[PDB]
Ligand SMILES: Nc1ncnc2c1ncn2[C@@H]1O[C@H](COP(=O)(O)OP(=O)(O)NP(=O)(O)O)[C@@H](O)[C@H]1O
């Protein structure tokens with residue numbers, strides 16, 4: 001209706017809503033029972049769901065209520081596709097589909113709004129993982145003429161009827177909770193002077209696309225460190241074949257993808273290196289590195305504890321899916337040394353993205369050091385406000401908050417984020433905690449931080 | 464946006480919201496603790512508040528989303544002003560202001576939508592009780608030419624700035640939760656081919672008015688049973704003087720209102736009957752019926768247990784405020800026998816309005832008989848659906864529901880109302896109750912009903 005009118009509308013939905021969740025919090029941090037914990041669980045779920053409908057609806061409304069103002073910055077696109085693929089990776093693997101990204105050429109470093117751009121790709125990507133039962137999802141980006149970039153999310157789902165393709169970018173249009181995820185993309189599009197559309201074919205799949213005039217910051221520096229070298233993919237999955245190919249050729253390699261351990265060999269150069277999907281495992285997890293060939297197994301993070309058996313069988317190494325082009329390159333260049341992927345490093349988890357609020361650089365260092373040793377990707381900020389700045393703009397799985405930090409108190413920094421809408425869990429560090437909770441903080445940790453404390457938290461808030 | 468789109472929007476806000484409240488219910492019907500009951504209380508409050516913002520916002524939206532269709536019926540206007548005054552009576556008396564209604568002449572029985580008309584008067588009345596700190600509120604209605612009726616809600620509040628008087632009937636316009644109560648009245652107005660407006664004067668008060676072309680069903684039959692008789696009002700309150708006057712003259716009496724026990728006497732006929740407000744009580748509740756005069760004390764329901772001392776002092780009787788013109792007339796005609804007002808009948812409460820769902824007419828009779836003996840005004844319906852019909856259209860304080868009733872199961876009748884938005888508490892009667900609660904029922908009662916059970920419920924859900 002108006003922006004002033006909405007700013008207080010939000011306060012009035014949110015305030016009682018945070019009220020509910022603060023209460024649910026406190027309750028569960030008190031001895032309860034069968035049923036009497038049954039209830040406080042099923043309440044925090046109904047509450048959490050409603051909060052995401054409310055943020056969705058207010059997000060939508062605040063985007064048609066003013067101009068919007070972008071905070072333009074240099075972003076690494078390959079790094080962005082990867083972050084999104086890696087956030088979606090858990091949803092996809094638990095339905096038994098694949099998520100992967102590739103670029104065909106090096107693209108430029110770009111001047112865009114990282115957070116808003118990511119929001120578009122998450123909307124397309126989530127949709128894709130929700131709607132496909134069969135192959136998987138491919139994130140793609142390619143430069144076009146006019147200083148323009150074009151992002152693709154392709155999926156082996158059931159596709160979109162030809163005439164239904166205008167409909168679905170409108171508010172509260174569904175398949176038959178909000179039905180706003182695309183409406184929100186339609187309005188971030190126009191704010192970047194972009195367009196968005198959809199293709200594919202009914203019953204084969206859907207491609208969702210975004211095409212935005214952008215500012216370049218950089219020469220797409222063109223280092224091809226796989227010049228010469230040859231690489232075979234054996235995977236029965238279409239997405240791992242397509243993406244893994246393009247990732248090779250982006251590093252200046254030649255790629256032979258095959259459905260089969262036996263086909264790969266059949267049509268690939270003899271000096272070629274063999275990438276083999278563990279989806280080809282026969283009974284007992286039988287996977288034979290074909291006699292007298294350099295071979296790398298492609299595992300999902302869950303398949304991590306197979307890595308020892310498959311190195312004894314004579315695989316020279318492993319890659320984790322979705323494939324990082326950087327770790328891909330490091331492994332092929334063992335046609336002759338790289339660190340263990342952070343996603344199987346965890347003592348429990350896969351790689352939780354973590355925001356660290358600590359103002360002492362050296363205490364941050366020691367926290368970061370135990371964090372990255374349970375596979376966490378960690379961002380650090382000095383004070384309680386440029387935390388808020390970076391806990392909206394950001395996307396993260398946990399938030400570690402100092403309390404006696406200057407700028408803003410830990411407690412009023414929590415409160416601030418909880419009242420701003422964002423739902424990410426928050427653990428406090430220090431050496432009067434019942435207000436902490438109700439204020440909107442989920443856990444407490446004894447500072448200085450410790451291996452075994454940090455594990456508890458990683459297992460509790462990342463699964 | 465659309466009505467189809469809104470019908471599922473509502474489902475999606477409501478469903479998780481009922482989820483929260485079902486859970487809050489179950490929790491509180493299990494042994495808890497200091498804090499661990501502290502929490503389940505403060506949750507059911509934050510939830511209940513949010514539900515009323517949601518119903519408000521969906522109500523508003525569903526009124527601009529279609530035509531609306533009125534269910535026209537014969538309504539008694541004097542009976543309607545009274546019902547509203549009596550619903551507002553508790554809010555007003557606990558801030559120490561007065562609510563009263565009068566008509567000047569008998570009006571016709573009218574063909575209107577009772578529920579929607581009431582909703583307008585509640586919106587105006589609530590506002591009035593919320594915004595006045597000083598005198599009180601007067602509900603008024605008078606016939607005009609064109610078959611038109613005009614309703615007034617006047618208040619000794621701080622009034623409305625002359626130019627602010629268009630503004631305030633718009634959505635999300637405030638004083639500086641929703642700010643929708645008048646927006647909703649603006650759209651029920653237009654649906655009755657009415658107009659609505661406001662008058663008064665800054666810092667003296669505000670009159671809120673509704674003027675609707677209507678259908679007449681009846682001759683305003685003109686029985687004046689106080690022809691001849693004279694009546695003096697002594698009250699320091701402006702509203703009780705104004706309303707109490709007009710109520711006399713509507714029955715064809717002559718009225719002399721005075722601020723004072725001593726002024727009344729000073730200028731009233733000697734044969735006149737004296738109505739004296741207990742707000743004139745001096746210390747210890749001293750109130751002298753002036754020697755050798757027929758006098759009736761006007762009490763608020765809380766002042767009920769003073770009725771014995773004041774009959775010994777020589778008052779011939781009492782009226783409860785806000786004054787019922789019917790009980791007024793019955794008392795004056797003791798210039799020479801009426802039942803005890805239902806509002807001080809309660810063993811605990813004042814008069815809870817109660818909806819009774821029972822299909823056996825004779826079991827309804829026995830329930831009604833204990834109900835009306837704790838001051839309840841009771842409506843009865845045969846089955847679980849024309850309950851829904853009459854628990855929206857209606858306004859009530861408790862709902863007594865049979866379970867093994869034909870038409871609709873008690874449980875799916877609850878569920879139906881809880882999903883329709885309405886918040887009124889619901890107690891079930893019979894001889895597997897944990898689903899009852901979560902389904903949206905608040906209490907259980909052993910059928911057949913009993914004095915002491917019914918008291919519990921009246922004290923728990925009416926205060
Ligand atoms: N990859 C896809 N394949 C097929 N249908 C899709 C795909 N992505 C989106 N849709 C359809 O597009 C509609 C609108 O999508 P969207 O606005 O994201 O709503 P939602 O995902 O249904 N609800 P919300 O969770 O708020 O995002 C969905 O209801 C689907 O009907």
Ligand SMILES: Nc1ncnc2c1ncn2[C@@H]1O[C@H](COP(=O)(O)OP(=O)(O)NP(=O)(O)O)[C@@H](O)[C@H]1O
Pocket residue numbers: 519586590591594618620621622623631632636637638640641642643644645646669
């Ligand atoms: N009797 C009154 N005296 C003075 N101001 C009033 C009165 N009634 C209404 N108002 C003003 O009118 C505004 C709009 O009223 P309304 O739409 O009822 O919103 P609300 O009462 O503020 N919020 P809501 O509870 O949804 O009704 C209020 O915010 C007050 O500013």
Ligand SMILES: [Mg+2]
Pocket residue numbers: 123126127130181
């Ligand atoms: Mg979606």
Ligand SMILES: [Mg+2]
Pocket residue numbers: 586589590593644
């Ligand atoms: Mg109001």
